[PDB]
Amino acid sequence: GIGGTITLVGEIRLRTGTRIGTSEEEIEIGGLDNPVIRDPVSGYPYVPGSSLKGRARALFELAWMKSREIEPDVFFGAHHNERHECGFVRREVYEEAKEYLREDPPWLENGTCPVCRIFGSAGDGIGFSDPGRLEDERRGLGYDPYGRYRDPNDAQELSGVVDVKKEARVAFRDAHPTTYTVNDVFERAGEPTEVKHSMERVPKGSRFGLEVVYRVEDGEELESDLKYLMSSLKLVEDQGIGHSTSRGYGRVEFRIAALCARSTGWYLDPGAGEGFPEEEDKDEAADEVTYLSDLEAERYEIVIRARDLEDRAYLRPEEWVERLDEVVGELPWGR
Numbered sequence: 507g508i509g510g511t512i513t514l515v516g517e518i519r520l521r522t523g524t525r526i527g528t529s530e531e532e533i534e535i536g537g538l539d540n541p542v543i544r545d546p547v548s549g550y551p552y553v554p555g556s557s558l559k560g561r562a563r564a565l566f567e568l569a570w571m572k573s574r575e576i577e578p579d580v581f582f583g584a585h586h587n588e589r590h591e592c593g594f595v596r597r598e599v600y601e602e603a604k605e606y607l608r609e610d611p612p613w614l615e616n617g618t619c620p621v622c623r624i625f626g627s628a629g630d631g632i633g634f635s636d637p638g639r640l641e642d643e644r645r646g647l648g649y650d651p652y653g654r655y656r657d658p659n660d661a662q663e664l665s666g667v668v669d670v671k672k673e674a675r676v677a678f679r680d681a682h683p684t685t686y687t688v689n690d691v692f693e694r695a696g697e698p699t700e701v702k703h704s705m706e707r708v709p710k711g712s713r714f715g716l717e718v719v720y721r722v723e724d725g726e727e728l729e730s731d732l733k734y735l736m737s738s739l740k741l742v743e744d745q746g747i748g749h750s751t752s753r754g755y756g757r758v759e760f761r762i763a764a765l766c767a768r769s770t771g772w773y774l775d776p777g778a779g780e781g782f783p784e785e786e787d788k789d790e791a792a793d794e795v796t797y798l799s800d801l802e803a804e805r806y807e808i809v810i811r812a813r814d815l816e817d818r819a820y821l822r823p824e825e826w827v828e829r830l831d832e833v834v835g836e837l838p839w840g841r
């Protein structure tokens with residue numbers, strides 16, 4: 507593998523202001539999904555890591571599906587139109603399943619599923635190895651859409667191969683407002699106030715700390731994962747961290763100042779350390795990445811700064827993608 511982590515560090519800037527929370531009514535009618543909620547502890551609005559991850563996953567899986575022109579029946583299976591889950595999460599699974607495949611599942615790349623391997627999966631949620639479920643009208647699609655990919659008679663064999671849970675390679679830290687956001691942005695607007703345990707709103711320009719941790723598991727999929735992870739963040743930028751019935755809700759920017767890497771080997775000799783954010787990083791960033799001033803420096807093996815790649819304090823998700831060859835070359839994986 508071997509293991510260890512790559513940590514994205516920066517902040518989320520809102521391009522638009524938002525309400526805090528939702529309502530019983532909107533929740534009932536199936537309308538406004540708003541991830542920005544009140545923190546019982548601090549009393550300030552924040553964006554839970556799980557909500558960011560969920561949103562990034564929901565948008566990426568759709569983009570992945572359409573980019574490969576896959577019919578939703580095939581892509582979502584028994585889940586119909588959302589939450590794609592498959593067990594093709596490691597190359598072993600595909601090699602092991604290849605004998606029973608008439609044709610490659612179209613959402614696969616080099617034998618594995620980017621959606622599920624990155625954002626996790628409960629297993630064979632789409633029911634790829636469960637034709638009985640698929641063909642049932644109430645429990646499935648009323649037919650088997652996977653005929654061309656596998657014989658329904660080989661499903662029970664597949665069911666011992668392709669139905670394995672996978673823990674997500676990415677984890678999002680709860681995004682709380684930065685000190686700048688509390689002392690300046692919130693103060694300038696007179697809202698929101700400290701309301702521990704609407705009619706207050708989160709002003710446009712508000713900034714929430716961004717930490718995203720990616721677990722390196724497969725060196726061969728490292729760069730590809732980073733591309734898709736960044737891409738999912740780009741999608742969240744374009745479509746919002748939340749949504750109403752009609753359009754996106756909560757326009758955001760992911761201002762990513764650095765990629766911070768720690769390999770398993772490095773834990774044996776921590777002293778070979780690059781710190782982030784250091785004082786220099788803080789002077790270079792804020793006012794552009796305000797979260798850095800709230801942070802004490804942490805020890806990493808290698809720190810890739812936006813400043814190393816470009817005359818910038820931060821790069822946006824799509825900008826990191828364009829320079830990923832350059833980035834991965836400097837990381838302690840792939841020799």
Ligand SMILES: [Zn+2]
Pocket residue numbers: 590591592593594619620621622623627
């Ligand atoms: Zn999948």
